[PDB]
């Protein structure tokens, strides 16, 4: 996260760290959506142009974390993966369209003050909240700058951007399964997700019921926090029918 700040304790209890077993390192962010299911970006697991293709046994899920590098004894919980599910129409060839994956845990994780699931949006909450200018919140342990790494989980609040502005900021083809967020050059404020924040959640707090909803997944961006560029996020609601299908069939 660039130009963010340290998270408060328990501020993002759905935040998940995807952790590579060997070498031991941060692979991506992710989010807890139930006691057995974790949501992330497909490119965290599968990206052939960079020779990335992780299997279940390659990774661990670390939940309840605050410190990036510490083993947070008595606080974090570490889970093994039963199965990975990548969207069947994930477009890694072109533009990361449908950049979404689910991971089923081998065993249910116990909820605590530090571990708690985020809601997924319904059609109405999505329609109400996913509007230009409305701010969401992104969290992660990724880079502090485009080109270092944080001691603890970082957080930044960013406004959703009008679709034409998103489109006009890039030569890449944008789809309805993506949205973009961030400040414009003339807005003064800044902030962005970055490398390592991949797969983590873009959340919004509903003013109707005071619950946090995951509207986006950190997907892609041209560099980080560049003037005139924006962060792109997987549109969770647009892909919710797939999420429900996977959970209904394999849950």
């Amino acid at each position: 996260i660039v130009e963010g700040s340290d998270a408060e304790i328990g501020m993002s209890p759905w935040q998940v760290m995807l952790f590579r077993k060997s070498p031991q390192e941060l692979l991506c962010g992710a989010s807890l959506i139930s006691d057995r299911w974790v949501l992330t970006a497909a490119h965290c697991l599968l990206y052939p142009p960079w020779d990335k293709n992780f299997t279940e046994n390659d990774l661990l899920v670390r939940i309840g974390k605050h410190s990036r590098t510490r083993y947070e004894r008595n606080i974090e919980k570490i889970s093994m993966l039963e199965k990975i599910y990548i969207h069947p129409r994930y477009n890694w060839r072109e533009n990361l369209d449908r950049d979404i994956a689910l991971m089923k845990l081998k065993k249910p994780v116990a909820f605590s003050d530090y571990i708690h699931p985020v809601c997924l949006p319904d059609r109405e909450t999505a329609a109400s909240l996913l509007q230009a200018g409305y701010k969401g919140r992104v969290t992660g342990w990724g880079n502090l700058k485009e080109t270092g790494q944080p001691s603890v989980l970082q957080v930044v609040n960013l406004p959703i951007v009008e679709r034409p502005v998103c489109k006009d900021s890039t030569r890449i083809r944008i789809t309805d399964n993506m949205f973009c967020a961030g400040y414009k050059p003339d807005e003064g404020k800044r902030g962005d997700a970055c490398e390592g924040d991949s797969g983590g959640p873009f959340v919004m707090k509903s003013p109707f019921n005071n619950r946090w909803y995951q509207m986006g997944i950190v997907s892609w961006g041209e560099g980080c926090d560049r003037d005139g560029k924006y962060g792109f996020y997987t549109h969770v609601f647009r892909l919710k029918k797939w999420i429900q299908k996977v959970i209904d069939q394999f849950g």
């Binding site: 209890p13 605590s112 699931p117 707090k205």
Partner: peptide, 28 residues
Amino acid sequence: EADCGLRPLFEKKSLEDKTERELLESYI
């Protein structure tokens, strides 16, 4: 499930975090 999106250290105990108000203020 039924309790999703309500944080034990915040919503559950009616405490606000330091910047959630910024989100609320954007929701016009």
